[PDB]
Ligand binder design. Structure first.
Ligand SMILES: Cc1ncc(COP(=O)(O)O)c(CN[C@@H](C)C(=O)O)c1O
Ligand SMILES: Cc1ncc(COP(=O)(O)O)c(CN[C@@H](C)C(=O)O)c1O
Ligand SMILES: Cc1ncc(COP(=O)(O)O)c(CN[C@@H](C)C(=O)O)c1O
Ligand SMILES: Cc1ncc(COP(=O)(O)O)c(CN[C@@H](C)C(=O)O)c1O
Lengths: 462, 459, 465, 461
């Protein structure tokens, strides 16, 4: 017997709040999950189209994955990275030989526990490989929350600072918070994205002038999200190819931060593979294990691997490569390959596109949408004016009243229909589900969006 | 059927090395673990007196922990911090109400995944609460490897930099590795004030005063230095808590290593009659069964954070299956009284170490509590350490010149794993429930290893 | 009777080089100066159309300025800024009531010794006033060489690093070199034909991106934007609407505007200060060069009444030994008293108009002159390959000094002009930075332009290759 | 005919305040200066035992230095650093061959306008030469107010921050105020504690700090041989041990001689009391005896050679200012010719003995030390034998000056005609011209005697 009133009391009383003050907070307990659904203590089933944080690629509580964890618990236990296990070595091989086997740039994997720890590892390797201090990031990027990963995060609403409750008054960012350069977002400069008559996007051209103003000899790496997860954008098609050609011409590394866009999320194994370019470093988390257990990774190129191999690297993480986490990655990745979830995700994206077309023609509050596989960004506008309700947009902070935030009104409304859908940004949806989400579930979720958008466009909420 | 020949191949070929070059590296496979033992694929049983990284407090592969986990897998799944679950809520309650119940300073918990992450969170909170930029650390502290945690880590041999193979020439720290003051180690100077204050504390005070207390958020300590391998003078901890209070600065006690029974008490600081403002946790929190880390803050600090919206997310923070593993691990320590058992075993080790120091002039000094012991190693004839740079070394030097490496190699001939990170200093640990027989086996193997050290044949 | 050969040995032997290796170094001694001329020990008279560093506004060795200095020496000696003197008090008053008397935003002045120290001061003041850490600068700005001033300098060719002798393998910046944001230059985001791009709302994309940058970090994090009205060392002229758009953007974002007026200040641009061409007023001005026309070392910062009242409420724990030096102050008094009464600002205006019509003619004649713009005694000329119509030096303002001077058009031009006894050129590889005294003659202008003609002839024969 | 009533109004109204709020401030004008005297508008003669800022070594308005300037003004005008002048060349030559001519380490000079600009330069050169980022400084050092020079200043009362007026409420340092490590002050750990090997614990801890970071990370240690603003004297072994330590660690030593340079201490330079030689010297103050603003840096032959192989991309407009250099030459030619260093040693040995007597006569002098025309005097409470102002060199100017012993001595001294006192609250920093007369030294020393009389009676409380 679980006493759920008591669980809520303890949860109020003994856990530090994130995003809500204690005063406004209402615990939302989840007793179990499976597939694309969350089950409340009462037995209510909630369709999860945030997919938590787009990190449960394979589906909640996969039967093969759980079984593989249970088998792994017959042997382990725990050993640190200095010891070898079948699970750690198999997971590395699966990534290099099976998943990325058709590309010849990958050299080696390091496993860690979180996407943040992943981005920390890759910034560290990039600076050591080039012997250079500076790393370029882009406006609105999110690469993590930990010190180093946070320095390349350029959302002021996600930097572990503090805001007040429906107020501008009580805000601070963490005091003292660098060896980092902010380049233009892929979505900056558009009136249709502006180019320079050689065809280079103005976001890329001024990224190049920045790197040249500092000196390419000072700059280790450019770190990108192919599509911004928390920041919620899709790039112009030429953007990724152009950042790759630029970085190569400048002798600078390219790190694709694949924590969110990795493992089938975009109808391909990785976000980058949509554009015909290969990176120098990849960071991983989320879909790596489909959140069955905490895991993160970085893959480096042969050349970087060869350089690192020549020295003793004085770096230790206690839980890096934890064998039970690794067995989980093995099973997750094995299910993905044998069940063709990358293709399944691809086909389901195409079904989503066409629902999104139908909704756009019905709802003038949908300013625009794009995405692929199971990653969709939907831009919301005021239907009469065609412009964003919330002026600061991706530069907002959480100090504002949630019932003025369009993605919040939508989420509240969708909920009347057992569906969870919304976004991190105020004017933008970030829709994700499992790669194997069923058609009836997309149908239910799109219908709930339809019902919410009605309410939004009606104005009864102002 | 596991092909271990292959596994080592895949291990050589596709995983990045740490602490070894590719050319020197040889895979050391471990097929399974049980208790205080590790088992090789061929079936050699290795007695683990590292306790990996002093982080398997419960014993390896606890059947009750493993069953509690298997159970949580019937329901889960994954929900991020925004969702409440029984395991996350129970876990916080056990720490606040159950483990820390007789202390009234603690307020709330945040769960994260690793000790480094816990340290990041503590740094953030401290700076946020005080509205101040600077954090004080001490020489030879280890607080983790990620960005923020690294800045307060003062071991040049564990900052994720690069060294060569048996060579002084291929060295580098990470380019651009800043809101952080390094104070002296407790093990410095034992000289005092005549108003009785240790000089190390006095100068730490004088530091905070030179920048100005209004600039300084927090002093972060390890009660006993873990990777750095020290024990303090008894007076160090209370005089820090007092100095920080007087100047209105926070004290974070970094209990990632010393926490959950390691020292014969629930926490390292509990040996010293003081309460911290903030504590960081990992390792023994889940006994490494699954990746978990935590921060406990005071009622004062928690109340303050509670008035604000905190714009921080970590995907895996509060992972319900990790939290189920924490619940069980903690429930086992409480019901088996293992903190008590750690204290009692610690006293047996003290007396065993005495017979060693008596039998071996290369043991310069030792000290510890529960299942954490630092043994200082010296040249039996000169009575000084073998490796001159001591805790300021880097891993560029040849391991056949590092006493603690020589000790491990020899100890291994007895099937025992014992040694340390530091070149002249041992860090000995085992499970809270290590039996008298295993302690005996490890100390015997230590005997044999120091026998080899003192003969100087390794030169 | 000076031994100038020994002066040459000693200069070679005991002075640290700047911009040259010891081996390539050939000292150029100057025995004296007068007006717009430099005079060698042997008696070569060199027409100085660099005006040294756009810093000798009044002219070299003005007799009244030097006589005022000589007079000051019957009294001083030295006192530090804790004592008041007539000279310091007059200087501040001339700046506030007389020069800036038509504008009502100005509050107080603090004097220092250099333009760098002036920028340091301003940066300190803005951050204290706002209680915010970040300062926004621009691409290719130069704001000085000292610690803080350097951080807002975005020229990798002038951040006090080291390059090689016709090589970039020796090449290093100062290790370490930080609460600064780099905004796009006024001159970034122009098409292949030179039009600056605009919002369709009319806002220059450069300003639009600057705003976006500020809102990304949060305006509560940002103290000030520091600008040059006209980039001096970087050698640019803005679109007319840039200066007004930045003032309006800073106002809206609650951020300060610092006009770095060290080079463009005091007549340089045919008005008292650069910003007065643009119908806006800054929060803080930094000053130097033309403040004393280099007669003695002198820097300054002017701050608004609001900033002044706030700083007045507090004890400021800042000391600089030489700040306010009475003899340097007396030099500013005389310098400024001459500029006012000889109408040198109005004079500067009129000369520039004449220069414009000279360079118009030089452009019609020389296809290597891609473009030019300036005002008063500050002019920029972009140089191109007459044939390809692009600049010869592809890295442009992101170059460093490791490259071979005989491939730098601005070096070749300078060489050739020296054949006509004329000193002219630029710090940037593709762009000339022309300045003389505010009172230069028509003939000395004609003499400079003719040499530029001659130089451009040689540039176009390509024989320098 | 100057209207000094107008000079005051304009001074109050148009000058930014330092150290004083607009409300409390009252202008102290100085109409002329001569030798060791300052002259007010009304004709009052103030004997200056601060020597302004220990920066007018030669004496105020030296008639020879002043005439040299006038001569230079017959020819200049202004040239920047790329053009060679007789004055700039002679000044560097005087410094290297005549002044430092008995030590064979000094290589090249760069002239700048201020002491801070001189420190900036040194830091830049040290980091470039070693290709290392970190500079070690010491608790209570003062090395300037400009960006880089401020990073190595460790006195919170001099970091260009703001405090309130008799109040703890309105204080702030600059947002942003970093590649610098602060090592213990020479005067930390006191008899100063030593190593079992004789090494001072302050030096021992500096070494372990550099070793903790890695000597391969550390460009240089910058010191004041004797702390100026900070107001201290080192134990005799400190300077030699820091010199030995830096060499042992492959690390540069910057002697900041901005204050202690050019005779101040009864030798040419502060370090020269100690039998060692720095890798770099920074200079200001005594360089021109403040006749016109100058600063300079002197580097070793090794450092010079490395610099000479490169094009250095550094420009300072007034660096090398030709009139500033003619001021410098004449200043140095007078110092060498009047044997000012030797004169200074001698007046130092006279002052030592005057202070001794003052110490016998006054229990509030806890301690004194110095040399030449630089003397530090530790002011203590006669009853407890401890300092009046507990935060001592870690204070800030937010406190009421009527409670600062150095403010009290000052105002009572001003009653006898003599400006004497110091920057630190419990420490006097006494300086005069190198050619200060015996009569003036006697007069100042009486004035201190009179002042300490008032301090010790405690009517000020
Ligand atoms: C691209 C990217 N990199 C790195 C991270 C950090 O990974 P961890 O959360 O495992 O530390 C995230 C997390 N995102 C979450 C916050 C999201 O999608 O809302 C991410 O999307
Ligand atoms: C006191 C302390 N804090 C923080 C950490 C870092 O925690 P994670 O490894 O979970 O990030 C450690 C780890 N130490 C390890 C390296 C050891 O004991 O060898 C530690 O001892
Ligand atoms: C806009 C601007 N700000 C600040 C400075 C720094 O002033 P000082 O050099 O006096 O410290 C300069 C100088 N420039 C010079 C060097 C030039 O035009 O070459 C400048 O042009
Ligand atoms: C040792 C030292 N270095 C560097 C400086 C900076 O020089 P400038 O003030 O010219 O920039 C000083 C000045 N000090 C003054 C403030 C004093 O004696 O109190 C100094 O004493």
């Amino acid at each position: 017997k679980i006493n759920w009133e008591q669980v809520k009391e303890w949860d109020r009383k003994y856990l530090m709040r994130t995003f809500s003050t204690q005063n406004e907070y209402q615990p939302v307990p989840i007793e179990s999950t499976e597939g694309d659904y969350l089950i409340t203590p009462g037995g209510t089933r909630l369709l999860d189209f945030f997919n938590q944080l787009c990190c449960v690629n394979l589906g909640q509580k996969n039967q093969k994955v759980n079984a593989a964890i249970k088998e792994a618990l017959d042997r382990y236990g725990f050993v640190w990275d200095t010891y070898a296990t079948d699970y750690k070595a198999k997971a590395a091989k699966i990534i290099i030989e099976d998943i990325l086997g058709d590309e010849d740039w990958p050299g080696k994997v390091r496993f860690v526990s979180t996407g943040s720890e992943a981005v920390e590892t890759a910034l560290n390797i990039a600076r050591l490989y080039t012997n250079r201090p500076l790393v370029v990031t882009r406006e609105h990027d999110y690469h993590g929350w930990t010190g180093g990963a946070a320095t390349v995060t350029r959302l002021r609403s996600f930097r572990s600072g503090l805001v007040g409750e429906n107020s501008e008054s009580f805000s601070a960012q963490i005091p003292g918070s660098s060896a980092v350069l902010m380049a233009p977002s892929s979505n900056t400069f558009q009136d249709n994205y502006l180019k320079d008559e050689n065809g280079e996007l103005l976001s890329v051209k001024y990224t190049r002038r920045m790197i040249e103003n500092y000196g390419p000899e000072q700059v280790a790496a450019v770190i990108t999200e192919v599509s911004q997860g928390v920041g919620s954008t899709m790039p112009p098609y030429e953007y990724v190819p152009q950042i790759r050609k630029m970085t190569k011409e400048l002798g600078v590394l390219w790190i694709s931060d694949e924590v969110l866009t990795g493992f089938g999320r975009t109808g391909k194994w990785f976000g980058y593979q949509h554009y015909g370019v290969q990176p120098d470093i990849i960071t991983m988390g989320k879909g790596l294990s489909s959140s069955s257990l905490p895991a993160g990774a970085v893959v480096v190129s042969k050349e970087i691997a060869a350089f690192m191999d020549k020295h003793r690297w004085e770096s230790v993480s206690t839980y890096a490569g934890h064998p039970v986490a690794m067995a989980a990655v093995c099973a997750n990745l094995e299910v993905m390959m044998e069940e063709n979830l990358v293709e399944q995700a691809k086909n389901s994206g195409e079904y989503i596109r066409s629902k999104l077309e139908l909704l756009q023609e019905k709802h003038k509050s949908i300013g625009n949408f794009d995405g692929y596989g199971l990653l969709w960004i939907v831009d919301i506008v005021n239907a009469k004016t065609k412009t964003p309700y919330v002026k600061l947009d991706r530069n907002f902070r959480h100090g504002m009243n949630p019932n003025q935030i369009p993605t919040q009104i939508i989420m509240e409304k969708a909920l009347e229909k057992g569906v969870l859908i919304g976004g991190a940004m105020p004017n933008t949806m970030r829709i994700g589900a499992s790669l194997n989400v069923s058609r009836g579930d997309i149908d239910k979720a799109m219908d709930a969006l339809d019902y919410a958008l009605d309410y939004l466009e009606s104005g009864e909420w102002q």
